[PDB]
PDB file of C-alpha atoms in Angstrom:
ATOM      1  CA  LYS M   1    -196.856 -73.292 100.207  1.00 21.89           C
ATOM      2  CA  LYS M   2    -195.824 -72.268 103.758  1.00 24.19           C
ATOM      3  CA  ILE M   3    -192.001 -71.867 103.886  1.00 22.95           C
ATOM      4  CA  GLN M   4    -190.286 -71.427 107.201  1.00 24.85           C
ATOM      5  CA  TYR M   5    -188.090 -68.313 107.218  1.00 24.03           C
ATOM      6  CA  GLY M   6    -186.724 -67.087 110.537  1.00 21.37           C
ATOM      7  CA  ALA M   7    -184.204 -64.555 109.115  1.00 22.06           C
ATOM      8  CA  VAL M   8    -184.675 -60.901 108.823  1.00 20.25           C
ATOM      9  CA  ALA M   9    -188.087 -59.487 107.382  1.00 18.18           C
ATOM     10  CA  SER M  10    -187.523 -56.784 104.904  1.00 19.04           C
ATOM     11  CA  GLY M  11    -190.845 -54.861 105.226  1.00 19.83           C
ATOM     12  CA  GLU M  12    -190.995 -54.129 108.910  1.00 18.68           C
ATOM     13  CA  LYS M  13    -190.659 -50.789 110.527  1.00 19.89           C
ATOM     14  CA  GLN M  14    -187.409 -52.018 111.593  1.00 16.32           C
ATOM     15  CA  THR M  15    -185.900 -53.118 108.307  1.00 17.30           C
ATOM     16  CA  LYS M  16    -183.430 -50.037 107.990  1.00 15.17           C
ATOM     17  CA  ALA M  17    -182.873 -48.845 111.549  1.00 11.77           C
ATOM     18  CA  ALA M  18    -181.802 -52.436 112.381  1.00 15.39           C
ATOM     19  CA  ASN M  19    -180.038 -53.072 109.186  1.00 15.04           C
ATOM     20  CA  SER M  20    -177.612 -50.230 110.135  1.00 13.67           C
ATOM     21  CA  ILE M  21    -177.058 -51.752 113.599  1.00 18.47           C
ATOM     22  CA  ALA M  22    -176.669 -55.561 112.558  1.00 16.25           C
ATOM     23  CA  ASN M  23    -174.183 -54.370 109.725  1.00 16.89           C
ATOM     24  CA  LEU M  24    -172.204 -51.939 111.810  1.00 19.52           C
ATOM     25  CA  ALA M  25    -172.000 -54.466 114.686  1.00 19.80           C
ATOM     26  CA  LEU M  26    -170.940 -57.088 112.165  1.00 19.92           C
ATOM     27  CA  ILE M  27    -168.170 -55.129 110.400  1.00 18.86           C
ATOM     28  CA  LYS M  28    -166.929 -53.929 113.794  1.00 19.41           C
ATOM     29  CA  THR M  29    -166.261 -57.604 114.385  1.00 19.48           C
ATOM     30  CA  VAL M  30    -164.728 -58.554 111.050  1.00 22.47           C
ATOM     31  CA  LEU M  31    -162.377 -55.368 111.222  1.00 23.51           C
ATOM     32  CA  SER M  32    -161.282 -56.785 114.639  1.00 26.59           C
ATOM     33  CA  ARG M  33    -160.316 -60.149 113.332  1.00 27.83           C
ATOM     34  CA  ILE M  34    -158.003 -59.112 110.343  1.00 26.21           C
ATOM     35  CA  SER M  35    -155.791 -56.949 112.952  1.00 28.04           C
ATOM     36  CA  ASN M  36    -154.102 -60.079 114.001  1.00 24.90           C
ATOM     37  CA  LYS M  37    -151.819 -59.695 110.904  1.00 22.32           C
ATOM     38  CA  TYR M  38    -152.070 -56.038 109.686  1.00 22.68           C
ATOM     39  CA  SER M  39    -151.971 -53.335 112.439  1.00 25.21           C
ATOM     40  CA  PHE M  40    -153.913 -50.413 111.083  1.00 24.03           C
ATOM     41  CA  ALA M  41    -156.144 -47.535 112.535  1.00 27.93           C
ATOM     42  CA  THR M  42    -159.604 -47.396 111.190  1.00 27.27           C
ATOM     43  CA  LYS M  43    -161.022 -43.801 110.377  1.00 28.64           C
ATOM     44  CA  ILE M  44    -164.651 -44.079 109.450  1.00 26.79           C
ATOM     45  CA  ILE M  45    -167.221 -46.961 109.173  1.00 23.63           C
ATOM     46  CA  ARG M  46    -170.120 -45.667 107.358  1.00 23.05           C
ATOM     47  CA  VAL M  47    -173.053 -48.130 107.096  1.00 24.37           C
ATOM     48  CA  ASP M  48    -176.191 -48.015 104.976  1.00 22.98           C
ATOM     49  CA  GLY M  49    -178.014 -51.297 105.189  1.00 20.88           C
ATOM     50  CA  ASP M  50    -175.854 -53.727 103.346  1.00 21.50           C
ATOM     51  CA  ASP M  51    -173.895 -51.238 101.679  1.00 22.29           C
ATOM     52  CA  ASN M  52    -170.933 -50.023 103.900  1.00 20.74           C
ATOM     53  CA  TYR M  53    -167.462 -48.973 103.536  1.00 17.99           C
ATOM     54  CA  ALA M  54    -164.733 -48.643 106.237  1.00 18.38           C
ATOM     55  CA  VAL M  55    -161.478 -46.617 105.654  1.00 15.80           C
ATOM     56  CA  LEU M  56    -158.358 -48.336 107.215  1.00 16.64           C
ATOM     57  CA  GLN M  57    -155.178 -46.118 107.574  1.00 17.89           C
ATOM     58  CA  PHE M  58    -151.861 -48.077 107.768  1.00 20.52           C
ATOM     59  CA  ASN M  59    -148.434 -47.548 108.890  1.00 18.71           C
ATOM     60  CA  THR M  60    -146.446 -48.025 105.551  1.00 20.41           C
ATOM     61  CA  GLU M  61    -147.375 -47.010 102.155  1.00 20.80           C
ATOM     62  CA  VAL M  62    -150.177 -49.319 100.730  1.00 22.52           C
ATOM     63  CA  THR M  63    -148.499 -51.880  98.263  1.00 23.28           C
ATOM     64  CA  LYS M  64    -150.019 -54.470  95.999  1.00 21.52           C
ATOM     65  CA  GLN M  65    -149.713 -57.279  98.534  1.00 21.46           C
ATOM     66  CA  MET M  66    -151.395 -55.335 101.535  1.00 23.65           C
ATOM     67  CA  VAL M  67    -154.344 -54.948  99.196  1.00 24.08           C
ATOM     68  CA  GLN M  68    -154.469 -58.464  98.099  1.00 26.44           C
ATOM     69  CA  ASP M  69    -153.852 -59.943 101.763  1.00 26.34           C
ATOM     70  CA  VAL M  70    -156.739 -57.680 103.182  1.00 23.18           C
ATOM     71  CA  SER M  71    -159.069 -58.658 100.401  1.00 25.07           C
ATOM     72  CA  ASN M  72    -158.346 -62.360 101.181  1.00 27.03           C
TER      73      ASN M  72
ATOM     74  CA  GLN B   1     -98.965 -55.666  66.185  1.00 28.51           C
ATOM     75  CA  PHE B   2    -101.184 -57.791  68.406  1.00 27.17           C
ATOM     76  CA  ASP B   3     -98.701 -58.883  70.770  1.00 24.65           C
ATOM     77  CA  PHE B   4    -100.764 -61.158  72.676  1.00 25.71           C
ATOM     78  CA  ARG B   5     -98.924 -61.612  75.968  1.00 26.69           C
ATOM     79  CA  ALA B   6     -98.375 -57.703  76.523  1.00 30.98           C
ATOM     80  CA  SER B   7    -102.163 -57.190  75.780  1.00 32.61           C
ATOM     81  CA  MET B   8    -103.817 -59.257  78.376  1.00 32.78           C
ATOM     82  CA  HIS B   9    -105.308 -57.327  81.460  1.00 35.78           C
ATOM     83  CA  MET B  10    -106.752 -58.543  84.903  1.00 33.32           C
ATOM     84  CA  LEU B  11    -109.968 -56.527  85.484  1.00 30.17           C
ATOM     85  CA  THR B  12    -110.675 -56.636  89.199  1.00 30.41           C
ATOM     86  CA  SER B  13    -114.202 -55.934  90.531  1.00 29.64           C
ATOM     87  CA  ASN B  14    -116.410 -57.142  93.155  1.00 30.28           C
ATOM     88  CA  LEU B  15    -118.259 -60.414  93.558  1.00 30.16           C
ATOM     89  CA  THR B  16    -121.953 -59.456  94.468  1.00 31.02           C
ATOM     90  CA  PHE B  17    -124.048 -56.219  95.407  1.00 30.16           C
ATOM     91  CA  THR B  18    -127.570 -55.834  96.066  1.00 34.00           C
ATOM     92  CA  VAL B  19    -128.367 -52.170  94.703  1.00 34.22           C
ATOM     93  CA  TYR B  20    -131.156 -50.488  96.343  1.00 31.83           C
ATOM     94  CA  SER B  21    -132.507 -47.526  94.715  1.00 33.50           C
ATOM     95  CA  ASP B  22    -135.298 -45.923  96.814  1.00 33.82           C
ATOM     96  CA  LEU B  23    -134.372 -45.957 100.706  1.00 35.78           C
ATOM     97  CA  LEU B  24    -137.495 -44.640 102.356  1.00 35.69           C
ATOM     98  CA  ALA B  25    -139.497 -47.740 101.487  1.00 35.44           C
ATOM     99  CA  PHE B  26    -137.991 -49.412 104.585  1.00 37.62           C
ATOM    100  CA  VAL B  27    -138.821 -47.215 107.295  1.00 37.77           C
ATOM    101  CA  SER B  28    -142.467 -47.107 108.554  1.00 36.26           C
ATOM    102  CA  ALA B  29    -143.397 -43.764 110.250  1.00 36.77           C
ATOM    103  CA  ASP B  30    -146.072 -43.257 112.684  1.00 39.00           C
ATOM    104  CA  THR B  31    -147.957 -40.108 114.290  1.00 38.26           C
ATOM    105  CA  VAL B  32    -149.038 -39.467 117.822  1.00 38.56           C
ATOM    106  CA  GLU B  33    -152.543 -38.504 118.560  1.00 36.19           C
ATOM    107  CA  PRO B  34    -152.916 -35.145 117.122  1.00 34.84           C
ATOM    108  CA  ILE B  35    -154.367 -33.489 120.095  1.00 34.78           C
ATOM    109  CA  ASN B  36    -150.967 -34.496 121.716  1.00 36.15           C
ATOM    110  CA  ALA B  37    -149.208 -32.786 118.900  1.00 37.28           C
ATOM    111  CA  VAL B  38    -146.050 -30.792 120.024  1.00 32.87           C
ATOM    112  CA  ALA B  39    -144.763 -27.614 118.481  1.00 35.96           C
ATOM    113  CA  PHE B  40    -141.044 -26.353 118.505  1.00 39.92           C
ATOM    114  CA  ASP B  41    -141.636 -25.387 122.221  1.00 41.89           C
ATOM    115  CA  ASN B  42    -143.122 -28.213 124.308  1.00 40.65           C
ATOM    116  CA  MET B  43    -146.702 -26.822 124.751  1.00 37.41           C
ATOM    117  CA  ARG B  44    -149.266 -28.226 122.280  1.00 37.90           C
ATOM    118  CA  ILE B  45    -150.541 -26.634 119.163  1.00 37.68           C
ATOM    119  CA  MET B  46    -154.175 -25.881 119.310  1.00 38.62           C
ATOM    120  CA  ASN B  47    -154.005 -26.137 123.366  1.00 33.11           C
ATOM    121  CA  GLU B  48    -156.795 -23.578 123.953  1.00 28.44           C
ATOM    122  CA  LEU B  49    -160.570 -24.226 124.663  1.00 27.78           C
TER     123      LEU B  49
END
């Protein structure tokens, strides 16, 4: 069975040096679109393949609604 | 004796309040960029190179 699969190939030499590019350059974009509603100032964006975190520092104290409306 | 007419009273208070306990939940402070952080004299702290 020959299945067409044009996506990324986990198993190249490239599979970790370009999972840290393609995931940093993705989350640098999705952190730009949520700044139309909440104005913040991001501090670090650490990325490890898929698994990444990105600390956001706000103006006010973080409440139970800014956590819910960023996760949404 | 329970003299009724001499024992009523008119209790005068207000109509409505809105009691707020904590006040610094309203302001939202910021900080300028810490390389432009100014001491009590108007040069900057950690100025040297």
